[PDB]
Design a protein around this nucleic acid. Structure first.
Lengths: 187, 106, 104, 128, 147, 53
RNA sequence: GCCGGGCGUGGAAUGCGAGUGCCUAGUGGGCCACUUUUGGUAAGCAGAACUGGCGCUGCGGGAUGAACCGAACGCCGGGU
RNA sequence: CCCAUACCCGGCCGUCGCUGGCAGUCGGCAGAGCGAGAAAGAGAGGGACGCUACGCCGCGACGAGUAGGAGGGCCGCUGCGGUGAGCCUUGAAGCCUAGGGCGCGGGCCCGGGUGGAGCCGCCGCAGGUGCAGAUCUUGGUGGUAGUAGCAAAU
């Protein structure tokens, strides 16, 4: 008789990707090796991020990484992002880049490579930098999905600016009693 | 009446009142709720200054005795078991005690 | 067909399962409900904080060098203590070379 | 004179009797195959003394001797002579077993081929 | 895949994943969105505030084509023309500014949502905002109206 | 019987709809009937165009 | 309210990795006991407070036993 | 002095944890180490096994369970696309069995008997897919029982 609780002794985390993609499953075979035989904690983060679901590795825009690479103590390092690099049409000039991502959209290749940049894949990243030396590990906006605007405290609550689920928006869809001070009350 | 006794911190000061951020336990959760109370129902709690006094000597005894090169205790240690000592029983002999008999007092 | 009316029996036990979490403390708590006339001034003091930009960079810098002159005007027994020195890797190498000749 | 295995370890089983379904003796509609009782008052379910035993994972055999015959081998079903060239490199660990529906003219080709490849057969003396 | 569904794992379990005490009856709370002002009052206040009541003017014969005005921001304004057009202006030395016909691309109103590259344009749109007009003027372009 | 946070749905099934369900297994056979009389139309008026006036 | 600069002996004891967000079933008839306790002559009655039980739980003991005393359970050998 | 499924010791199973270890099988293009209390360099001027990496291996700790939730089924049923140069009148399916076995278990594989013509393994796909109960439905058969009974009107 031991007085403990087995409620949360099984840690909930991914230990291998649910995806059956063999090219993804080959990368994990490569980085499982690099994570445990190098003391570099960079590879442990990349290993953990390869397991994650698509909703946990959101796309990195092209202008976001430009915004993060124009920071001072940089511009020689390499851009490493486990998600995918989409092209941002609302930026005009493109500096030359050294990018490593899982997947690059067709327009974002042509716009990067036209600027004399360089696109890398994760097998070529390990060849050029095994321990992750001189790289900047980035991530797209994780809570930028439309879904999180419904989360939080429920709507119809004091100071709970949360988007409700409505089948269509209009003047006669959730503009009455809970919302107008003239109709009953409001929050 | 649920705050009579509860202690909090001030976050807003008006003419005759203050706003307090106090904790209120409500059925298995604590809420840091803001209440507006007049000055008359308010005292400066002294549950803090004796630590503020302890900060003075801790800043005093850290600057002082540093030039002496010594290391003096700062943390409060709990009341230890008392050390070995003697007890002088000079001349007199310890008086003998005896349980008294029963006297029905009523 | 009466029934029970109210009871707080299993409740205290139910609350401490997931713990009674204290409210999450965080520096810079929100400035909500603070009286407007004081807050309205506080936004003006933050609006005009660029006005003293040249003074501040030219106040701490002359205070940065003034700190660089107050420094520039200044800048259980020996037996077990001995055996504790032979037993050290990084600074006992020269010591135990005397024993290596003891076999010789 | 047999084809002895690699190593013959002492097999030790935690239980040798089968597990019977609850009340499988009292009825003919209740077959012997184990079904976990889910009744709310069932004795067997709530582990009373002197009842039928419920199979746990605690009765798991040793992994060193799991799926091991008494002869120190492990079975492998075989349908034709071509499915024997697999086992010519596991001679001391895995025995061969000719499947049921293999005819009698094909069984007396497998067994002597399995005598050439030195693989043990667990049902050699077949229909014949 | 019926073989992946839950009911395959509920075979044998009596209540089939719906409890013994509170059995799976037909309709315990009523059919549809019933009890809005009644026994389901809390759910409609906590998750659909504003569901009950009327507001506004009843417009009878709404023809959606009249109120059609798809906007375009100034951020993606140059995406309406080819990259050859955008480069041949910064290379041009006569000050010749390309004309962007917005209506041709499909939009009507121009709103100014971001920065602009400093080279003039003459946007042939149908509606403009105030701030949108400022950005185009301040760059050095012109705002021409068309119907 | 609504659950927690969801969306207020109004399905239009309170009528007796399972009698008037128009399924579309005509659709692959329908196209062939269309095409094979569209070519036979053009065969009739062979020099005149296929789209018509 | 802002900057800027300087101070770690981490300023009680003990123990322990935490934080956080989604989706969510069942339940919403309970019952018993030490102590406190209301009505009632009282009740294996009715109604509460606190904690633990039973329900959801076998086991050793109380001959017998939903709740008492001990002690909570993978399958086994030895010891206690 | 007696004994509980409690405690100690030892074995075995499983789960959980170490987000543990292993691509170093680096061989006459060879030289066999990284268990070491102490932030960092065995630095250059002919030879067993293994590693279905979704694999293998080592340590600890832990194991009750209705309602309920999830995971794994090389558990089972029927059909489909592939595949097994699969099996079969020298005997398929089904059925019987005091036979020999494996698996914790769902179950399964052999032996023998009967039968007479089709069937299964593996990777995927699909569902009208697993029964002890529903005063369940249909069919059948018992105990009662060689019993009640075969007695209105000469």
């Amino acid at each position: 008789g031991v007085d403990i609780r087995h409620n949360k002794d099984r840690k909930v985390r991914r230990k291998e990707p649910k995806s059956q993609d063999i090219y993804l499953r080959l990368l994990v075979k490569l980085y499982r090796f690099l994570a445990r035989r190098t003391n570099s904690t960079f590879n442990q983060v990349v290993l953990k991020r390869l397991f994650m679901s698509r909703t946990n590795r959101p796309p990195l825009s092209l202008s976001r990484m430009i915004r993060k690479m124009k920071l001072p103590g940089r511009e020689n390092k390499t851009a490493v992002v486990v998600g995918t690099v989409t092209d941002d049409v609302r930026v005009q000039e493109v500096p030359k880049l050294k990018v490593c991502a899982l997947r690059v959209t067709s327009r974002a290749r042509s716009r990067i490579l036209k600027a004399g940049g360089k696109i890398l894949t994760f097998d070529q990243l390990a060849l050029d930098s095994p321990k992750g030396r001189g790289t900047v590990l980035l991530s797209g906006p994780r809570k930028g999905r439309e879904v999180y605007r419904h989360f939080g405290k429920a709507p119809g609550t004091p100071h709970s600016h949360t988007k409700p689920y409505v089948r269509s928006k209009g003047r006669k869809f959730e503009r009455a009693r809970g919302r107008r001070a003239s109709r009953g009350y409001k929050n | 009446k649920c705050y009579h006794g509860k202690t909090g911190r001030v976050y807003n000061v008006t003419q005759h009142a203050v706003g307090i951020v106090v904790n209120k336990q409500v059925k298995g959760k604590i809420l840091a709720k803001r209440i507006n109370v007049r000055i008359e129902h308010i005292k400066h709690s002294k549950s803090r200054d004796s630590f503020l006094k302890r900060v003075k000597e801790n800043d005093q005894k850290k600057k002082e005795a540093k030039e002496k090169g010594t290391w003096v205790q700062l943390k409060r240690q709990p009341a230890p078991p008392r050390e070995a000592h003697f007890v002088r029983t000079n001349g007199k002999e310890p008086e003998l005690l005896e349980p008294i008999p029963y006297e029905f007092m009523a | 067909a009466k029934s029970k009316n109210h009871t707080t029996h299993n409740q205290s036990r139910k609350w401490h399962r997931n713990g009674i979490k204290k409210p999450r403390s965080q520096r810079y708590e929100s400035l909500k409900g603070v009286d407007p006339k004081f807050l309205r001034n506080m936004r003006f003091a933050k609006k005009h904080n660029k006005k003293g930009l040249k003074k501040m960079q030219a106040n701490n810098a002359k205070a940065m060098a003034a700190r660089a002159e107050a420094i520039k005007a200044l800048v259980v027994s020996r037996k077990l203590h001995r055996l504790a020195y032979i037993a050290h890797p990084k600074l006992g190498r020269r010591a135990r070379a005397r024993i290596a000749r003891g076999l010789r | 004179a047999a084809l002895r295995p690699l190593v013959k370890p002492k097999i030790v089983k935690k239980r040798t009797k089968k597990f019977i379904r609850h009340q499988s003796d009292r009825y003919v509609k209740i077959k012997r195959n184990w079904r976990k009782p889910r009744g709310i008052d069932n004795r067997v379910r709530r582990r009373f003394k002197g009842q039928i035993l419920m199979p746990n994972i605690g009765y798991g055999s040793n992994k060193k001797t799991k799926h091991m015959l008494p002869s120190g081998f492990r079975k492998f079903l075989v349908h034709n002579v071509k499915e024997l060239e697999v086992l010519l490199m596991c001679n001391k660990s895995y025995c061969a077993e000719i499947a049921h529906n293999v005819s009698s003219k094909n069984r007396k080709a497998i067994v002597e081929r399995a005598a050439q490849l030195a693989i043990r057969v667990t049902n050699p003396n077949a229909r014949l | 895949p019926s073989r992946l569904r839950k009911t395959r794992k509920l075979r044998g379990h009596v209540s089939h994943g719906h409890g013994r005490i509170g059995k799976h009856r037909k309709h315990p709370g009523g059919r549809g969105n019933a009890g809005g002002m009644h026994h389901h009052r809390i759910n409609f206040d906590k998750y659909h505030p504003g569901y009950f009541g009327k507001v506004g003017m009843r417009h009878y014969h709404l023809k959606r084509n009249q109120s059609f005005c798809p906007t375009v921001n100034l951020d993606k304004l140059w995406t309406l023309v080819s990259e050859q057009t955008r480069v041949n202006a910064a290379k041009n030395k006569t000050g010749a500014a390309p004309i962007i016909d917005v209506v041709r691309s499909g939009y009507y109103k121009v709103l100014g949502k971001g920065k602009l590259p400093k080279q003039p344009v003459i946007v042939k749109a149908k509606f403009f905002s105030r701030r949108a007009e400022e950005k185009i003027k301040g760059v050095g372009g012109a705002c021409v109206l068309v119907a | 019987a609504p659950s927690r946070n969801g969306m207020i749905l109004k399905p239009h099934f309170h009528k007796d709809w399972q009698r008037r369900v128009a399924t579309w297994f005509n659709q692959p056979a329908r196209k062939i009937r269309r095409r094979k009389a569209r070519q036979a139309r053009a065969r009739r008026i062979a020099p005149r165009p296929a789209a018509g006036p």
